[PDB]
Design an enzyme around this catalytic site. Structure first.
Site, short mmCIF file in Angstrom:
data_model
loop_
_atom_site.label_atom_id
_atom_site.label_comp_id
_atom_site.label_asym_id
_atom_site.label_seq_id
_atom_site.Cartn_x
_atom_site.Cartn_y
_atom_site.Cartn_z
CG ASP A 288 39.22 45.10 47.02
OD1 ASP A 288 39.77 44.17 47.62
OD2 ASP A 288 39.83 46.15 46.67
CE1 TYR B 55 45.31 49.07 47.26
CE2 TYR B 55 45.53 47.63 49.17
CZ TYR B 55 45.11 47.84 47.87
OH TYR B 55 44.46 46.84 47.20
CG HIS C 244 39.77 39.67 45.28
ND1 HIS C 244 39.53 40.11 46.56
CD2 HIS C 244 39.87 40.74 44.45
CE1 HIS C 244 39.48 41.42 46.48
NE2 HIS C 244 39.67 41.85 45.22
C1 LIG Z 1 45.54 44.76 57.30
C2 LIG Z 1 44.08 44.47 57.11
C3 LIG Z 1 43.73 44.36 55.64
N1 LIG Z 1 42.50 45.13 55.27
C4 LIG Z 1 41.49 45.22 56.35
C5 LIG Z 1 40.38 44.22 56.11
C6 LIG Z 1 39.35 44.43 57.19
S1 LIG Z 1 42.77 46.58 54.38
O1 LIG Z 1 41.80 47.60 54.75
O2 LIG Z 1 44.17 46.92 54.42
C7 LIG Z 1 42.41 46.09 52.70
C8 LIG Z 1 41.16 46.37 52.16
C9 LIG Z 1 40.83 46.02 50.86
C10 LIG Z 1 41.84 45.38 50.17
N2 LIG Z 1 41.89 44.90 48.89
C11 LIG Z 1 43.12 44.35 48.65
C12 LIG Z 1 43.50 43.80 47.36
C13 LIG Z 1 44.77 43.27 47.18
C14 LIG Z 1 45.17 42.78 45.95
C15 LIG Z 1 44.32 42.84 44.87
C16 LIG Z 1 43.05 43.36 45.03
C17 LIG Z 1 42.66 43.83 46.27
N3 LIG Z 1 43.86 44.46 49.73
C18 LIG Z 1 43.09 45.09 50.68
C19 LIG Z 1 43.40 45.45 51.98
#
Ligand SMILES: CCCN(CCC)S(=O)(=O)c1ccc2[nH]c(-c3ccccc3)nc2c1
Ligand SMILES: CCCN(CCC)S(=O)(=O)c1ccc2[nH]c(-c3ccccc3)nc2c1
EC number: 3.3.2.10
Lengths: 546, 546
Positions: B334, B465, B523
């Protein structure tokens, strides 16, 4: 007035330099002089090497670009590159051959110890070669001794661009006239000079150090041999294992490789191994320096039996199990030396090799109580004083600073007598109230011990002397055994409690015993002769512990 | 009613037995039947083997005694021992060949899980052979799964002496009718029978397990595949490193060998790696399972910038430096998967190999802000909800048990929608107040997370985030690079946030990329498919990480 010293890596802190090997390769292959160096610098700020130094590309992505530059250069020179010309091969052995320039680091260390803010400023790359670890290990050893490490590939700037020099002054929090800058390349030295920095053109280290000593006013050349690197408690990794309910064991951990468990004596700390921890880790071992039961951040239950050898040994076995370690090399000093012999006697499958400092291995006399044999030797009267619960704790815990200042002394510094402590009614009876600070320890080192001993005091530590009969009975069961695993005995000439003569009959029970001996060394072996302790242990570990 | 199960090692938990190899050696050398076994047992309770089993002598001191017994036996049989007959050699390979009897341990584990007190009772020696580690490793793996381990050489008693059986009942705190005893030797079984214990004469494991299942009333044969071994938090070694003033990193450590750094995701713990930690350590790796910055026992500063990728990566580098580690294999899931790709991009010399679970590597778009590209995909609306400091913390911290019960679910168990979380005004809006307990987790596992999150809450976790723009700008500097170090991408079929299709273009930037794929996996990869995760990681580590 100078307050910062900046050092280059290649040609200054690390020898030999890459461009020195680029020239040696030209000669070896009988190529035109400067062909490989011209190829390397091709296109200056717009070329392949500048992109690599800024971190735009990794080393591997750079290899085929350096290859094309070598072909194009050799074409203009109207020469031929050999049949099996390989940049990967040339650079692999150039990086591999490069070692720390020991006199330069020593001077950098002298400067830092004398108030200077020190830094490494280097034009380097992102190394993704399969062999990258050799360099990673080189950087780790150097970086720990400096306040800053500035790498071109990490800041996106390079020498001789004046931005990196302005970046250096900002991280240093110094104005140019306050900085000494050592570089082997004149062109990379010119912008530091222009800003108003003291600059040293490094060729031979001796001439550069003469220049550096003259300008700083600090003696860097012809200095006395320095002590090994020590430990700063807050910079260590601190480990904690629960061996049984309410009994937790604390340890300091450093390094990778075979597990080396260090067991301190009375009345010490993991911190007694301060000069061994970095040296042994640098030697390729995973050091686990214990706070033994009753000490520092480890649990100190009040019951006497909790400190008998059978219980302590069983707990070290549990410590290994809980960390997922099938074996460890056990190195002990004083009471730790004793435990370490019993670990080899009772659990040889968990003991890779065993080493003792000062403490001999003497088999139990089944025809005599140890309590009646302690009385046979006049040196061991303090042991009888240590027997009654409460007495010695009150004296030792009275003034903590005085206790460690009185105990932690060299051969030529004794303030307390080992004999007739009972008759005098204490260990500090005809001892000063404010003892002078011994040569082996700083005020800071004594205070670390003072703070450690405030948690549980001396009850737990003293209980190691309170299991004579219990220990004897258990040791008697091992009377037909022999220590046949790799073993080292280190004697200390001037230890007057754990005398070298006490170790003379050891070969009867440990026939393959290897020995070590330290002249003009008192009881506190590790801090008395750290350079010697390190040489003996490292030589024995590399030959007998793998 | 039975409440304890006692198992022998040789011929029961460990196959093949020594006396089986003693017989196989007789056949191979064409010696009289039982010659070597008769030599081994020579003098019964007054002989060499009894002394060895009681711990009077070590294995090495025993070898020449077994030699003389073999000569004396061969003389009476009027036969000749071969030219190069060696007990050391015979016993070395007999000990070496001996492996865990997997079905027997599984049944021992089933019994313990169902309330039974389990123990290993064995006639064993003090092993001081140069090869002793193989056995030490064998004992370590077995012992962890039992409440007790009783070794004859440690208690000074042997089977079939009735004292060891009385010693066993005392340690078990059970009367004979409460104990099942499994032994391959009938003679060692007879005293347990005499006392009134249920006894099983082990020959083939299947017949013995049929007998054991019938008597306990517990199904041991034809059971569903068990989950891998998990972690009990209080049985782990807990490590702590200060990476900078007021920022401390917590980790769990187990095993020896190459360093394997495990990096969890949002909103997790080191405990998310519970089923990998024992498996990977057993596979010959030193596991360092992190509590990432903002989590558990690690520091959770409140500022957003403290959680940007540049800062987190720099801190992991410091973590390695402080532990004296030149390299580590970085395995992330993650948000940990994301960090792990950036460690390989920015510090490849510190990264032995890199592995990601679910998280793909996607290069930054230099022609677009990430905040405007998050809006392009409807699945990432929750990311916009996570933006405003305070909002999501209040919802997630409201009822901690509900949060983890709602989040930690399998593919066929979803209670919350990933889309229109902003429009609904929260992640739990049309979600139950008392969610049912998912199949992947026990009530105990959810509560460990509940207790962990009570220290710092969700501010630190949510700030990962909150660095989109900052992260983007830093990632843009790596746009000309390629990941050329060993790399693994593991996709999970039913992960609907980190979808397997998102990983399709990865080979453009990681050309030597090795892949893994898990079907019917959501997940929470590690706890959803632990057996599969372990197989993929171990196979990749042994081929690509050494
Ligand atoms: C906008 C692109 C989304 N991600 C890039 C993937 C290459 S991110 O870096 O924003 C990202 C990374 C890890 C994450 N993990 C979760 C997540 C959401 C809900 C529950 C657990 C994890 N959301 C994520 C978004
Ligand atoms: C009576 C025999 C003395 N020792 C046996 C040596 C083989 S001992 O086990 O009692 C022993 C062991 C370690 C010791 N360490 C000290 C000691 C005394 C003063 C200051 C520091 C250490 N006394 C010790 C006695």
């Amino acid at each position: 007035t100078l307050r910062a010293a900046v050092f280059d890596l290649d040609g200054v802190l690390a020898l030999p330099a890459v461009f020195g090997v680029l020239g040696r390769t030209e000669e070896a292959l009988a190529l035109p002089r400067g062909l490989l160096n011209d190829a390397f610098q091709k296109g200056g700020p717009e070329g392949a090497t500048t992109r690599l130094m800024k971190g735009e590309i990794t080393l591997s992505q750079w290899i085929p670009l350096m290859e094309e530059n070598c072909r194009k250069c050799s074409e203009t020179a109207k020469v031929c590159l050999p049949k099996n010309f390989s940049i990967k091969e040339i650079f692999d052995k150039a990086i591999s051959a490069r070692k720390i320039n020991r006199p330069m680091l020593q001077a950098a260390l002298m400067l830092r110890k004398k108030g200077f803010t020190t830094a490494i400023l280097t034009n380097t790359w992102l190394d993704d070669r399969a062999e990258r670890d050799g360099l990673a290990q080189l950087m780790c050893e150097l970086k720990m001794h400096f306040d800053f490490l500035i790498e071109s590939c990490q800041v996106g700037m390079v020498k001789p661009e004046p931005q990196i020099y302005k970046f250096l002054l900002d991280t240093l929090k110094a104005s140019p006239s306050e900085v000494v800058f050592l570089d082997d390349i004149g062109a990379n030295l010119k912008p530091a000079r222009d800003l108003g920095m003291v600059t040293i053109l490094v060729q031979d280290t001796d001439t550069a150090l003469k220049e550096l000593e003259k300008v700083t006013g600090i003696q860097l050349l012809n200095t006395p041999a320095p002590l090994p690197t020590s430990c700063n408690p807050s910079d260590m990794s601190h480990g904690y294992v629960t061996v049984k309910p309410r009994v937790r064991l604390h340890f300091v951990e450093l390094g990778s490789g075979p597990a080396v468990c260090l067991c301190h004596g009375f009345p010490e700390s993991w911190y007694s191994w301060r000069y061994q921890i970095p040296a042994l880790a640098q030697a390729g071992y995973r050091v686990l320096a214990m706070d033994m039961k009753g000490y520092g951040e480890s649990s100190a239950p009040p019951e006497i039996e909790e400190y008998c050898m059978e219980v302590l040994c069983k707990e070290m076995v549990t410590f290994l199990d809980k960390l997922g370690l099938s074996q460890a090399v056990f190195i002990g000093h004083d009471w730790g030396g004793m435990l370490v012999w019993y670990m080899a006697l009772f659990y040889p499958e968990r003991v890779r090799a065993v080493a003792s400092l000062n403490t001999p291995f003497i088999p139990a006399n089944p025809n005599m109580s140890p309590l009646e044999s302690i009385k046979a030797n006049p040196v061991f009267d303090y042991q009888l004083y240590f027997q009654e619960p409460g007495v010695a704790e009150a004296e030792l815990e009275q003034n903590l600073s005085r206790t460690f200042k009185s105990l932690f002394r060299a051969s030529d510094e004794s303030v307390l007598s080992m004999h007739k402590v009972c008759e005098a009614g204490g260990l500090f009876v005809n001892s000063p109230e404010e003892p002078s600070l011994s040569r082996m320890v700083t005020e800071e080192e004594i205070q670390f011990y003072v703070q450690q001993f405030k948690k549980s005091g001396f009850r737990g530590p003293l209980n190691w002397y309170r299991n004579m009969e219990r220990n004897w009975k258990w040791a008697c069961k091992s009377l037909g055994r022999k220590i046949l695993i790799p073993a080292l005995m280190v004697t200390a000439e001037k230890d007057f409690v754990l005398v070298p003569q006490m170790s003379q009959h050891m070969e009867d029970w440990i026939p393959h015993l290897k020995r070590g001996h330290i002249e003009d060394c008192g009881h506190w072996t590790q801090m008395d002769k750290p350079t010697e302790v390190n040489q003996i242990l490292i030589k024995w570990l590399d030959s007998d512990a793998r």
